[PDB]
Each structure stands twice: as structure tokens, then as C-alpha cells.
């Protein structure tokens, strides 16, 4: 089964990482992500 699909939810604001920018403290969001998931850091970095 290809699903249920797994989405990485941010640990500071509880939202999908692709929506951390529209949140108040993206700095914090970006911190937690690179400390937790470095591979999709480089994805969101480009």
C-alpha cells in the first residue's frame, strides 16, 4: 500500500514543513528542521 502517506509536521508550530513560512516564528521552525531533518532542509533551501 502506497498510502497512508507520511508528511513531516514541524515540531514548533505543528504544521507541514512547507507551510512553516506562513507562521509567526519561521526562524524557530527552520532551526528545529535542520536539527531534525537535514535532507529536506536542503530541499526547502533551494
Amino acid at each position: 500500500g502506497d498510502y497512508p502517506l507520511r508528511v513531516l509536521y514541524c515540531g514548533v508550530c505543528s504544521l507541514p514543513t512547507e507551510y512553516c513560512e506562513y507562521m509567526p516564528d519561521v526562524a524557530k521552525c527552520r532551526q528545529w528542521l535542520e536539527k531534525n531533518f537535514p535532507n529536506e532542509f536542503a530541499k526547502l533551501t533551494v
Binding site: 500500500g1 498510502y3 502517506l5 508528511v7 504544521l15 507541514p16 512547507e18 507551510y19
Partner: protein, 181 residues
Amino acid sequence: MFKKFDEKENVSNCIQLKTSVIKGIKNQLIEQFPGIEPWLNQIMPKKDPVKIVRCHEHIEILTVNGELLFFRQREGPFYPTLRLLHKYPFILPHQQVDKGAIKFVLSGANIMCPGLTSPGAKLYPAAVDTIVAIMAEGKQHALCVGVMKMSAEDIEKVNKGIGIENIHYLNDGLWHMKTYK
């Protein structure tokens, strides 16, 4: 739909129930959402019971293993939660709003036709009162669950007024009710 929820203070005005009419509540979900029949074996395995949760303004949420699956208000139609729609994003038809519309949908606002006729948007055929998943422009996961208040063809030709009602959105009161225990 969740305004009395988002005052923090979770697990306050919500009652959970044990013995429910389980199969008597499934067969309506297949008629509401046809493309889900091959997946309720995983979504609602018969090895695990369902537990209804009722919070006020007369909403009930279906839960299995704690996770929140669908919700409805009074006796209206069921809506999938976004957490579940994220796991199975093909449950609903998609309507895609433009990037500039995200912050507005994220604050509870309904979707205007400029949001759907923009270049970054993508509007698909949909009759009135159909449940749709609100995708955003450069985003992979649903932002919101809504219901067409005007047909897709009307949204195009008229091109103003309310197109899609905002029922449940990321970071709203249901979103932060993670699971019930």
C-alpha cells in the same frame, strides 16, 4: 467552524463514547466519497472499534485508535480531517488556490474567486455543495477542506463572491486537537 475550540484549554468540552453503531456509520462514507472503499481496511480496521467524540455547537468526530478521521455538524455531511486527508489525499476532489491566498485561508477566511482564477490557481469542475480539498500553489499537502458555494463554471464567469466555504483549515481548533485520550 471551530472558534470556541481555539482558546487552548484542550480536553474540556468533548465527550467520547464506547459502543457505537459502527458499520451503520461506514456505508454513508462510501457514498459521500466513492474513491475510498479500498482503504477503510486500513483507515478503520474491524480489529479496532470506532469511538465517537462530540464537542459543542453539535459536532461529532469519528476516531479509531485515538486518531481523528471524519467530523460532521448536527446531522450534516461528513468531512475528513486534514490529518487524515494528508494520509489519503485522494479522498476529495481538489481545488487549488494561488500562493497569495494561503495566509488568508490560514486565518479562517473563505475562498474568493480571485483566489481560484489567479494564474497560480487551478480550478476543476465541481458542482455546488461538493466537498473539496483546498490545495495551494507550490504546496504538496492540503491546506483546507471546503465546500463549493458556487459551481466551478459560475466561479469562472461570475468571478467574485464566495466560491468555497472554509470549513476546516490548518492550525484551526480541530487541527490542534491532536488525538483524544
